[PDB]
Design an enzyme around this catalytic site. Structure first.
Site, PDB file in Angstrom:
ATOM      1  N   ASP A  76      -4.880  38.439 -11.037  1.00 12.73           N
ATOM      2  CA  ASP A  76      -5.849  37.455 -11.776  1.00 12.73           C
ATOM      3  C   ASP A  76      -6.820  36.513 -11.252  1.00 12.73           C
ATOM      4  OD1 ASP A  76      -8.012  37.068 -13.911  1.00 12.73           O
ATOM      5  OD2 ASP A  76      -6.594  35.505 -14.767  1.00 12.73           O
ATOM      6  N   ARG A 102       0.413  34.346 -17.940  1.00 15.48           N
ATOM      7  CA  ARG A 102      -0.029  35.649 -18.112  1.00 15.48           C
ATOM      8  C   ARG A 102      -1.032  36.073 -17.254  1.00 15.48           C
ATOM      9  NH1 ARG A 102      -2.822  31.062 -20.661  1.00 15.48           N
ATOM     10  NH2 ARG A 102      -4.796  31.095 -19.652  1.00 15.48           N
ATOM     11  N   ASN A 103      -0.997  35.534 -16.177  1.00 12.57           N
ATOM     12  CA  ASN A 103      -1.844  35.960 -15.305  1.00 12.57           C
ATOM     13  C   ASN A 103      -0.939  36.212 -14.086  1.00 12.57           C
ATOM     14  OD1 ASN A 103      -4.321  35.989 -16.497  1.00 12.57           O
ATOM     15  ND2 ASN A 103      -4.386  33.558 -15.994  1.00 12.57           N
ATOM     16  N   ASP A 131      -6.780  29.922 -13.150  1.00 10.17           N
ATOM     17  CA  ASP A 131      -6.774  30.048 -14.310  1.00 10.17           C
ATOM     18  C   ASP A 131      -4.792  30.462 -13.713  1.00 10.17           C
ATOM     19  OD1 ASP A 131      -6.001  31.119 -16.661  1.00 10.17           O
ATOM     20  OD2 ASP A 131      -7.777  32.491 -16.400  1.00 10.17           O
TER      21      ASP A 131
HETATM   22  O1  LIG Z   1      -1.433  43.122 -21.826  1.00  9.77           O
HETATM   23  C1  LIG Z   1      -1.013  42.955 -20.836  1.00  9.77           C
HETATM   24  N1  LIG Z   1       0.679  43.341 -21.100  1.00  9.77           N
HETATM   25  C2  LIG Z   1       1.322  43.344 -22.167  1.00  9.77           C
HETATM   26  C3  LIG Z   1       1.992  44.254 -21.405  1.00  9.77           C
HETATM   27  C4  LIG Z   1       2.049  44.849 -20.827  1.00  9.77           C
HETATM   28  C5  LIG Z   1       2.450  46.294 -20.176  1.00  9.77           C
HETATM   29  N2  LIG Z   1       2.009  46.682 -18.709  1.00  9.77           N
HETATM   30  C6  LIG Z   1       1.027  45.933 -18.075  1.00  9.77           C
HETATM   31  C7  LIG Z   1       0.779  46.977 -17.439  1.00  9.77           C
HETATM   32  C8  LIG Z   1       2.206  47.528 -17.177  1.00  9.77           C
HETATM   33  N3  LIG Z   1       2.108  47.704 -18.550  1.00  9.77           N
HETATM   34  C9  LIG Z   1       0.520  47.034 -15.570  1.00  9.77           C
HETATM   35  C10 LIG Z   1       0.829  47.377 -14.603  1.00  9.77           C
HETATM   36  N4  LIG Z   1       0.105  46.840 -13.026  1.00  9.77           N
HETATM   37  C11 LIG Z   1      -0.872  46.353 -12.979  1.00  9.77           C
HETATM   38  C12 LIG Z   1      -1.322  45.980 -11.668  1.00  9.77           C
HETATM   39  C13 LIG Z   1      -2.482  44.926 -11.507  1.00  9.77           C
HETATM   40  C14 LIG Z   1      -3.025  44.925 -12.776  1.00  9.77           C
HETATM   41  C15 LIG Z   1      -2.786  44.670 -14.209  1.00  9.77           C
HETATM   42  C16 LIG Z   1      -1.555  45.827 -14.760  1.00  9.77           C
HETATM   43  C17 LIG Z   1      -0.402  46.216 -15.660  1.00  9.77           C
HETATM   44  C18 LIG Z   1      -4.491  44.058 -12.637  1.00  9.77           C
HETATM   45  C19 LIG Z   1      -4.654  43.278 -13.968  1.00  9.77           C
HETATM   46  N5  LIG Z   1      -4.383  42.008 -14.872  1.00  9.77           N
HETATM   47  N6  LIG Z   1      -3.675  41.814 -15.265  1.00  9.77           N
HETATM   48  C20 LIG Z   1      -3.018  41.303 -15.740  1.00  9.77           C
HETATM   49  C21 LIG Z   1      -3.042  40.208 -15.631  1.00  9.77           C
HETATM   50  C22 LIG Z   1      -3.729  39.828 -14.216  1.00  9.77           C
HETATM   51  C23 LIG Z   1      -4.367  40.730 -13.447  1.00  9.77           C
HETATM   52  O2  LIG Z   1      -4.964  40.786 -12.501  1.00  9.77           O
HETATM   53  C24 LIG Z   1      -2.732  41.167 -17.550  1.00  9.77           C
HETATM   54  C25 LIG Z   1      -2.133  43.020 -18.002  1.00  9.77           C
HETATM   55  C26 LIG Z   1      -1.703  43.274 -18.198  1.00  9.77           C
HETATM   56  C27 LIG Z   1      -1.523  42.025 -20.072  1.00  9.77           C
HETATM   57  C28 LIG Z   1      -1.593  41.177 -19.757  1.00  9.77           C
HETATM   58  C29 LIG Z   1      -1.243  40.025 -20.984  1.00  9.77           C
HETATM   59  F1  LIG Z   1      -0.522  39.659 -20.853  1.00  9.77           F
HETATM   60  F2  LIG Z   1      -1.986  39.106 -20.251  1.00  9.77           F
HETATM   61  F3  LIG Z   1      -2.330  41.083 -21.621  1.00  9.77           F
HETATM   62  C30 LIG Z   1      -2.380  40.747 -18.483  1.00  9.77           C
END
Ligand SMILES: O=C1NCCCCn2cc(cn2)-c2cnc3ccc(cc3c2)CCn2nc(ccc2=O)-c2ccc1c(C(F)(F)F)c2
Length: 285
Positions: free
Chosen positions: A163, A149-150, A145
């Site tokens: 991801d 977005r990942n 995947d």
């Molecule tokens: O909603 C999403 N973003 C909208 C705006 C962003 C807001 N925002 C997010 C953080 C700080 N601000 C954030 C900060 N640190 C992180 C550390 C580890 C993780 C996630 C984290 C998320 C592991 C989990 N993980 N998450 C994703 C992709 C792979 C993954 O492994 C993933 C997270 C969020 C979003 C998406 C998608 F775009 F696909 F939809 C995808």
């Protein structure tokens, strides 16, 4: 309390973790992503991200997920998301602690109209992704995947391939099809042609997805094939048609994407070859 408890090497005491349940930063199918504060082994504060698996409620289904994703603690690479540890409490599901990424997913950061990444910035992001996938390929690990977005983006503009392992989930339901009878989650417009026909995945299909990720970067987050529905996508590909070249894509970079989409999985380049070719484009112009 089940079989292999060699997870003790990465166990975090619940009194050493604060989960800010009021701040959701991600919504997967297995659970949400929260802000967090972790006390390190040396006694210092750090930002972190807590991933709950509250929605998978079955001791057997949870033990299978934990044993599948515990391999990620042994991976170490600047372009691959690492595991900080897991916290197991008596109030339910396990929590996955991960390093905090200041800029979230790669795709949302480049779709943002208040951000000004240059063409060199976007090429540099794709080079960082290729270096991360080169590490995962040498350890014989197929991602399945790979998409913008990942992939995460930290404070120092470092891209982490994410991801996978204990962080595997559906974070954007729009682009996935849930298969009847297997229950697999299929990102249709990121999948190699042979994967749409057999639902098997290899590193060569990862290379196909990588080419789609490059197209994502050069368009700053445009959705692939906006004028082809999910049924016609396979005949469109069988006809030799591919994604068109973006307006601001250098010609050698579009040729790398065309190499990633070759009908024969074998004929595609390796991630080692992709690291060599992308770096050359980055260093010149
Ligand atoms: O909603 C999403 N973003 C909208 C705006 C962003 C807001 N925002 C997010 C953080 C700080 N601000 C954030 C900060 N640190 C992180 C550390 C580890 C993780 C996630 C984290 C998320 C592991 C989990 N993980 N998450 C994703 C992709 C792979 C993954 O492994 C993933 C997270 C969020 C979003 C998406 C998608 F775009 F696909 F939809 C995808």
């Amino acid at each position: 309390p089940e079989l292999v408890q060699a997870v003790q090497h990465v166990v975090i005491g619940p009194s050493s973790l604060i989960v800010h349940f009021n701040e959701v930063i991600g919504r997967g199918h297995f659970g949400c992503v929260y802000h967090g504060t972790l006390l390190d082994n040396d006694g210092k504060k750090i930002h972190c991200a807590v991933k709950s698996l509250n929605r998978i409620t079955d001791i057997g289904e949870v033990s299978q997920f934990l044993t599948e994703g515990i391999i990620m603690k042994d991976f170490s690479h600047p372009n691959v998301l690492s595991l900080l540890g897991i916290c197991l409490r008596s109030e339910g599901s396990p929590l996955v602690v991960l390093p905090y990424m200041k800029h979230g997913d790669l795709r949302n950061f480049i779709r943002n109209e208040t951000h000004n990444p240059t063409v060199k910035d976007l090429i540099g992001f794709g080079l960082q992704v290729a270096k991360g996938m080169k590490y995962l390929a040498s350890k014989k690990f197929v991602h399945r995947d790979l998409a913008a977005r990942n992939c995460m983006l930290d404070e120092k503009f470092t891209v982490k391939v994410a991801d996978f392992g204990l962080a595997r989930d559906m974070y954007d339901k729009e682009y996935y099809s849930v298969h009847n009878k297997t229950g697999a989650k299929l990102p249709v417009k990121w999948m190699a042609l042979e994967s749409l026909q057999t639902q098997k995945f290899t590193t060569k299909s990862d290379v196909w997805s990588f080419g789609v990720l490059l197209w994502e970067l050069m368009t700053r987050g445009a959705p692939p094939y906006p004028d082809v529905n999910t049924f016609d996508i396979t005949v469109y590909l069988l006809q030799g048609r591919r994604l068109l070249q973006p307006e601001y894509c250098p010609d050698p970079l579009y040729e790398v994407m065309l190499k990633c989409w070759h009908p024969k999985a074998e004929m595609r380049p390796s991630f080692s070859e992709l690291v060599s070719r992308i770096s050359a484009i980055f260093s010149t112009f």
